[PDB]
């Protein structure tokens, strides 16, 4: 499913991402915008053969099992297909693990390059308080 901006902000807030590890909601919405354009079904193959899945483009090299990433780890203990659901729960819980792994949101290259340091609160302007 393709979320709207505020719809996704609300869903991430409900699932506990607002200020998770100190990252305001706008950071998460911005990252999702540039990772997936808010599309839960987004997939993209990486050069090394891993694949990125879902609204936050979680990578099969470490975080989920897709059965075709030699050496993969599956640290979120989920099939990568679960990251494509219209229900964002699996993606959020896995993102919590990723952002807790030491490097914060820098794990998302697109967040580092397109969201970090910017006025990310613009991404939640107008969302229901």
| Residue 48 is assigned to a ligand binding site | no
Is 66 noted as a catalytic residue in this protein? no
Residue 51 sits at φ, ψ, to 5 deg, of -135, 145
Q: Which of 102, 86, 95, 89 is nearest to 63 (CA)?
A: 95
Give the helix, strand, coil percentages of the chain, each rounded to 5: 40, 10, 45
Domain limits, the chain: 1-129
Q: Which of 7, 48, 52, 119 is catalytic?
A: 52
Catalytic, out of 18, 35, 48, 87 = 35
Answer yes or no: are the C-beta atoms of 71 and 92 closer than 8 Å: no
Give CATH for domain 1-129. Answer: 1.10.530.10
Give the burial string for 86-115 (b: 16+ CB within 10 Å, else e).
eebebbbebbeebbeeeebbebbebbeeeb
- Resolution of this PDB entry, in A? 1.6
Whether the Cβ atoms of residue 16 and residue 10 lie closer than 8 Å to each other: no
Cβ(77)–Cβ(98) below 8 Å: no
């Amino acid at each position: 499913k393709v979320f709207g901006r505020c719809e996704l902000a609300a869903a991430m807030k409900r699932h506990g991402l607002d200020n998770y590890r100190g990252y305001s909601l706008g950071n998460w919405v911005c990252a999702a915008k540039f990772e997936s354009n808010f599309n839960t079904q987004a997939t993209n193959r990486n050069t090394d053969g891993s694949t990125d899945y879902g609204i936050l483009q979680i990578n099969s090299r470490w975080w989920c099992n897709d059965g075709r990433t030699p050496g993969s780890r599956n640290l979120c203990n989920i099939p990568c297909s679960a990251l494509l659901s219209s229900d964002i729960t699996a993606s959020v819980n896995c993102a919590k693990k990723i952002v807790s792994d030491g490097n914060g949101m820098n794990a998302w290259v697109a967040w580092r390059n397109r969201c970090k340091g910017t006025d990310v609160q613009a991404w939640i302007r107008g969302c229901r308080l």
